[PDB]
């Protein structure tokens, strides 16, 4: 009960972190857990409609907050709903350029290293590499 209340207050902005650190998706995932969104959505159902709408809106905004400011500026120009696809296309184009620049095997190793650093599932990395290879030809 306390965890959900604290999360609701934090997202609503009533209570900030100890050091007034920004309320980003990364920090929330670090503290509350990987699946904070699901538990928060389940808990919100026990609240009036206004609080439910506020919770949904705040969750959406926090999810938008998962990108750096530069990425949002470059890719979110034409709306937030189209942000994910534009970012994915830009990343795929960068991958294609890297492949055409410095081969494939080195590209495979680099993608593996970045997936290790970027906290990506092996399935997602494999899908990304296959997609970029298919886009090449």
């Amino acid at each position: 009960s306390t965890k959900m209340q604290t999360l609701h207050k934090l997202l609503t902005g009533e209570v900030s972190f100890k050091n007034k650190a920004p309320v980003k998706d990364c920090n929330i995932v670090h503290q509350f857990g990987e699946n904070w969104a699901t538990e928060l959505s389940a808990y919100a159902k026990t609240l009036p409609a206004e609080q439910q709408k506020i919770i949904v809106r705040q969750i959406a905004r926090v999810k938008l907050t998962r990108y750096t400011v530069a990425e949002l500026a470059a890719y979110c120009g034409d709306g937030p709903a189209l942000l994910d696809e534009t970012a994915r296309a830009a990343n795929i184009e960068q991958g294609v350029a890297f492949v055409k620049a410095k081969g494939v095997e080195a590209f495979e190793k680099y993608v593996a290293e970045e997936s290790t650093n970027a906290n990506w599932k092996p399935e997602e990395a494999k899908k990304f590499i296959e997609d970029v290879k298919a886009k090449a030809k």
């Binding site: 998706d25 995932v29 998962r66 990108y67 530069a70 350029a97 890297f98 997936s115 970027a118 990506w120």
Partner: protein, 270 residues
């Protein structure tokens, strides 16, 4: 780095074609602009009274000293000097003060004829260290360019450690962007244009110094003529103590004058 990031960080290379020549030209224009602002305004043009190349002046000094060397007796530093030694020092000091500005750094003669005060010794040490460092840096950058390594400096970092350390990726990605852009650019300036601008700035002073050196040589020649004439043949309280100064006293007097000039320069700015 908790939280699945949405994008993989490929190198920031998007300017696939960025010719090194254009980057060096921009780095030269910026350097010229900053140097012009720092120096101020070009000094007013100065017209030499007598046109005589520095080479001819050096030849004349060498010839005069070689001819008059007969009277060259060595003495201790704390000993009164001879007219010949005084003339030699007064001429070579101007000659080497000119050569140092002109850019011909010869740290063997400059350390003997131009350095008199400890401040001068410190300045000479700094100048020599800077010149050697610039030479080494230029050679190392040329070798690096031949090999093909990135022109700019690269820090000793292990980004797999940094990703783990920081919680949020944004500062780490920003740092990677900054350092990759730094290592993808050549912080090299075209020293020909810089030296040309500096030369244009230090033209009135050099010509004035050369004219002063010519005048000094023409004024010293009669004294040697009189000394040779006397050699071939063979109120007063003010002129009794007069004597040529010992080298150490010359060093101290030069230190006093230099400190006075430094104080005046410092007071000028406020």
């Amino acid at each position: 780095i908790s939280g699945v990031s949405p994008l993989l960080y490929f190198p920031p290379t998007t300017t696939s074609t960025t010719n090194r020549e254009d980057q060096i030209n921009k780095n030269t224009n910026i350097a010229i602009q900053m140097i012009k602002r720092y120096k101020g305004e070009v000094p007013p043009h100065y017209t030499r009274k007598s046109s005589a190349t520095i080479e001819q002046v050096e030849k004349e000094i060498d010839a005069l000293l070689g001819g008059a060397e007969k009277l060259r007796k060595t003495s201790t530093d704390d000993q009164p000097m001879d007219k010949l030694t005084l003339m030699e020092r007064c001429l070579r000091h101007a000659l080497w003060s000119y050569h140092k500005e002109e850019g011909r750094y010869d740290f063997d003669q400059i350390g003997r004829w131009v350095v008199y005060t400890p401040e001068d010794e410190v300045k000479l040490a700094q100048l020599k260290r800077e010149v050697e460092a610039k030479e080494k840096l230029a050679a190392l950058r040329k070798r690096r360019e031949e090999e093909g390594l990135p022109g700019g400096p690269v820090p000793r970092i292990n980004w797999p450690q940094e990703y783990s350390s920081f919680i949020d990726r944004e500062p780490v990605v920003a740092k990677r962007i900054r350092y990759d852009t730094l290592a993808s650019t050549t912080l090299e300036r075209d020293e020909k244009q810089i030296e040309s601008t500096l030369q244009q700035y230090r033209r009135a002073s050099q010509d004035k110094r050369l004219d002063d050196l010519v005048d000094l040589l023409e004024r010293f020649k009669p004294v040697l003529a009189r000394e040779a004439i006397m050699q071939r043949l063979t109120e007063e309280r003010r002129l009794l103590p007069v004597r040529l100064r010992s080298v150490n006293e010359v060093r101290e007097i030069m230190s006093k004058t230099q400190a006075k000039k430094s104080a005046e320069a410092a007071e000028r700015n406020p």
